[PDB]
Curated annotation (Swiss-Prot), chain A:
SUPFAM superfamilies associated with the record: Ribosomal protein L29 (L29p)
Coiled-coil portions: none
InterPro entries the record matches: Ribosomal_protein_uL29 (IPR050063), Ribosomal_uL29 (IPR001854), Ribosomal_uL29_CS (IPR018254), Ribosomal_uL29_sf (IPR036049)
Top-level division of the source organism's lineage: Bacteria
Keyword Ribosomal protein annotated: yes
Gene: rpmC
Keywords for the protein's UniProt record, in alphabetical order: Ribonucleoprotein, Ribosomal protein, RNA-binding, rRNA-binding
Protein name: Large ribosomal subunit protein uL29
Disulphide bridges, residue numbers: none
Organism, scientific name: Escherichia coli (strain K12)
Record note on quaternary structure: Part of the 50s ribosomal subunit. Contacts protein L23, trigger factor and protein nascent chains. Might also contact SecE and probably does contact SecG when the SecYEG translocation complex is docked with the ribosome.
Similarity remark: Belongs to the universal ribosomal protein uL29 family.
GO biological process, one term: ribosomal large subunit assembly
Molecular function terms, GO-annotated: rRNA binding; structural constituent of ribosome
Curated annotation (Swiss-Prot), chain B:
Entry keyword Ribosomal protein: yes
Pfam family, one: Ribosomal_L23
Upper classification of the organism: Bacteria, Pseudomonadati, Pseudomonadota, Gammaproteobacteria, Enterobacterales
Effect of residue 18 to Q: Strongly reduces trigger factor binding
GO cellular component, one term: cytosolic large ribosomal subunit
Encoding gene per record: rplW
Effect noted on mutating residue 52 to K: No effect on trigger factor binding
Organism: Escherichia coli (strain K12)
Protein name: Large ribosomal subunit protein uL23
Keywords from the named record: Ribonucleoprotein, Ribosomal protein, RNA-binding, rRNA-binding
Assembly behavior: Part of the 50S ribosomal subunit. Contacts protein L29 and trigger factor. Might also contact SecE and probably does contact SecG and SecY when the SecYEG translocation complex is docked with the ribosome.
Curated annotation (Swiss-Prot), chain C:
Chain ranges passing through the membrane: none
Protein name, UniProt field: Apidaecin-1B
Parent-protein start and end of this portion: 44 to 60 of 144
Domain of life: Eukaryota
From Swiss-Prot, chain D:
GO terms, molecular function: structural constituent of ribosome
TM regions (residue ranges): none
Whole-protein coverage range: 7 to 45 of 46
The protein's name in its UniProt record: Large ribosomal subunit protein bL34
Organism: Escherichia coli (strain K12)
Subunit structure: Part of the 50S ribosomal subunit.
Gene: rpmH
Domain of life: Bacteria
Length: 63, 93, 17, 39
RNA sequence: UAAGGUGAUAUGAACCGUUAUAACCGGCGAUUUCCGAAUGGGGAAACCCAGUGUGUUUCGACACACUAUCAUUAACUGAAUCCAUAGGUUAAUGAGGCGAACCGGGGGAACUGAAACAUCUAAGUACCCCGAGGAAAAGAAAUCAACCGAGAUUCCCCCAGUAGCGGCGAGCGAACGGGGAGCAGCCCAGAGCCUGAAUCAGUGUGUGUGUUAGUGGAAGCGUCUGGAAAGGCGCGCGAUACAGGGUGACAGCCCCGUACACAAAAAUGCACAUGCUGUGAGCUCGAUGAGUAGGGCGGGACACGUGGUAUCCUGUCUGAAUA
RNA sequence: ACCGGGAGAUAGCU
RNA sequence: CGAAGGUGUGCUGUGAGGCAUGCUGGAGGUAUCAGAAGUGCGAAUGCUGACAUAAGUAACGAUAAAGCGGGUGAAAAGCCCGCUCGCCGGAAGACCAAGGGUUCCUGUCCAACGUUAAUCGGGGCAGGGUGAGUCGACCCCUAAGGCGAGGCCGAAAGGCGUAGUCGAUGGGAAACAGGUUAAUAUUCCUGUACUUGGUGUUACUGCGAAGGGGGGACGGAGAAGGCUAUGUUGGCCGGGCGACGGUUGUCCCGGUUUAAGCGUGUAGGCUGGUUUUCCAGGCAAAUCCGGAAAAUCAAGGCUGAGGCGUGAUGACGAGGCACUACGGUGCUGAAGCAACAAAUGCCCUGCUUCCAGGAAAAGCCUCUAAGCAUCAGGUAACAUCAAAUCGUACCCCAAACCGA
């Protein structure tokens, strides 16, 4: 989904990063303790998504 | 002001133990494994922002790694910080 | 959850388990 | 002995302070030992 | 490039895609916690304490950028002593560390043999410190033997363990000349005629050759031993590829694949012609890098005792012209 | 005194 | 259809050796001819791995000492429960420092260890366990010591040193009663408390820093009294009438505890108090301190354990009442007062004597130049908060540190 975040503006990228970190990071981390998180690829997917988001905002803005 | 991103990147996960289960109702206290530093102010602000609960004081401790020697060379476990959070009246997961 | 740890094959004089 | 005096006499910083400490550390690094001075 | 993949110990669920957003490789980029030259201060290496400039829907502290040292340059201020300088502030230039040896330097032993021994090989070696560059160092003549001689230096072959020296005792090591890789000479010190015309550096253009991932790439079956054939036997073919490696025993024709022909969106080394920017065509006649050459006093050193001292730096005194 | 080197040292002898 | 190697036989030559083969071996060896040997081992107290006799030999580790009924377990003088005997008890007990680094608790196992044994353990595996404004570290200052910007002597070196710098085992502020789990309590829960700093409100309102004063901040030796912990006794409360002679009594068993703070400021110790003048004293400053002189009063001022009422219509509790995985959980829970002795603890850094004069700085009270003295700053009370970070398991004169 590289093109999805590539076109987004700085404010939209910040909002996406905020909502992702708030919801998905914990919804996978809290469930990762025990009794939940049947699918394990969600952690890797969210980590890659946040890494891609952080990769942006360094060249789109301030460069 | 503490950045919400920092608040979200200090709480690792709740710690499951029988002592924690007893404390859930004995004193309305919970145990959470948190980041290495996990300053009381930052973690308290994170808890208030996320769970919308009331906390007056949070205790902190560090658990030393346990040396493990099974078959191969000795091994150590990463040191982790545990926080006892006492909620005033609000009960939440 | 990660119950399986993949215990390795031990020595001839190993804990009987 | 005590850990304080041990570090002050043969610790990384203590040895590095003297001129010969740099040579000793370079020799150790060339040797490849995991621990340089202590701990 | 792609139909398999989430590197392994070391299995399992989990899913990701199948013809171009699975995954892998390479080029260009961003992030790059703490100690470590560690550079804001302290400090027991991976710890603590801080100071300024920016933005805070709780303005209780957070997040981003700087805060060590040498000499110099630019600019602004500024003592002795009016400008001038001593001193101060902002930005820049290189560096304090590591890396195994290679060069130039500053110091530097001990054991051992020579009748012990002055002295010497030992040994300017082991070892300590500074700079250095892919080479460094050194080197275009007041260079060498002197009566004939070459015209840069470096290294190799002998020349040559030869001449000589040494309580002629241990050992030490020459020169000239010849043959080889290689050759380039010079710069300005200074006036005119003539100009950005040769050469050099930078900046872009397009070509070739390579690198940083890669593509294609020839030809085989039967029987017996046979655990399985790649082994004996029937025979055919490829070969610009019978180097090598893997496949249930020894494989050219099972595979990777070697010969050979191709491949670059982007960067990168070298060779080209050129727009542009700077050092700067070519000719003439001068001219000789000055307190210098030389000499004297006093240091260390050619086996040796400043000595009859040719010579190496001078602590110090004298002291010519430039063919 | 220990470490690494001079030094796989040195004369006689086992 | 069986290579090298291993292992036996037979045939061979004067010999180092050569050939065939049974079995194992299950994949390489190599005719003849020439070259290189890290080339042929039987000892150098030669070096590395394994295996021996000495040998079932002393010892099984202070000569404090174990035994029985029941339970787990197949196996119990070594484990678990109950009973009896014994040892230490100014320790062989308990709490901290250095040191060790999870050895601490639970569940589970017997690969290896415990001088033989385990089902057990300071052993393996899995889980849990350490909660701090009041404990300490941390941080401010600091002694010896180091570094030691500038800077002096000094050919280079070397010697020395202004300021700063760290450097604690030294000085600087604060919490206890009861409970809590198998492992954590000055931390968690009820209470009452206290310290440092910021903001606002109310009321009053002379501060700064350097400059000073007391204090911080101190040595050795010697003796007296009171108080407290603690213990004995008396009364009181609850439970009892003795396996066998007596034992309703002048009888036996258990309890009769409560912290810090708050006001009282006593016993004791120290100082004699009030007013006025100067200081050439504190680098010129002082409204504070001390020194030098006058008038007045007698018992004023400082320090000071312990006891007293609150803290505490509490907790703690002897001993009972219900549910129980028999391990335990909840409720109630009577009395809780006097006399004596007394310490190394406190009054007490108190009192007498002495030479060897027994550190310094910071925080803290004092009034102090300019100025503000409506303001700002300072003081009394209330509300709001912040006090970060680091160890809080366990052993710690010992089975866990140092000696293998």
């Amino acid at each position: 989904m590289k093109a999805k975040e590539l076109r987004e503006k700085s404010v939209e990228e910040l909002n996406t990063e905020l909502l992702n970190l708030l919801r998905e990071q914990f919804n996978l981390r809290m469930q990762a303790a025990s009794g939940q998180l049947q699918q394990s690829h969600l952690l890797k997917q969210v980590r890659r998504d946040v890494a891609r988001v952080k990769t942006l905002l360094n060249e789109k803005a301030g460069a | 002001m503490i950045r919400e991103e920092r608040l979200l990147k200090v709480l690792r996960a709740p710690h499951v133990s029988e002592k924690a289960s007893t404390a859930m109702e004995k004193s309305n206290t919970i145990v959470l494994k948190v980041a290495k530093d996990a300053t009381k102010a930052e973690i308290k602000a994170a808890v208030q922002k996320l769970f919308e609960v009331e906390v007056e004081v949070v205790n902190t401790l560090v658990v030393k790694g346990k040396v493990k020697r099974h078959g191969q060379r000795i091994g150590r476990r990463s040191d982790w910080k545990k926080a006892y959070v006492t909620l005033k009246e609000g009960q939440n997961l | 959850n990660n119950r399986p740890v993949y215990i390795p094959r031990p020595r001839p004089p190993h804990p009987r388990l | 002995p005590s850990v304080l005096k041990r570090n002050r006499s043969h610790g990384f910083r203590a040895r590095m302070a003297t001129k010969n400490g740099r040579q000793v550390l370079a020799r150790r690094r060339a040797k490849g030992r995991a621990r340089l001075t202590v701990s």
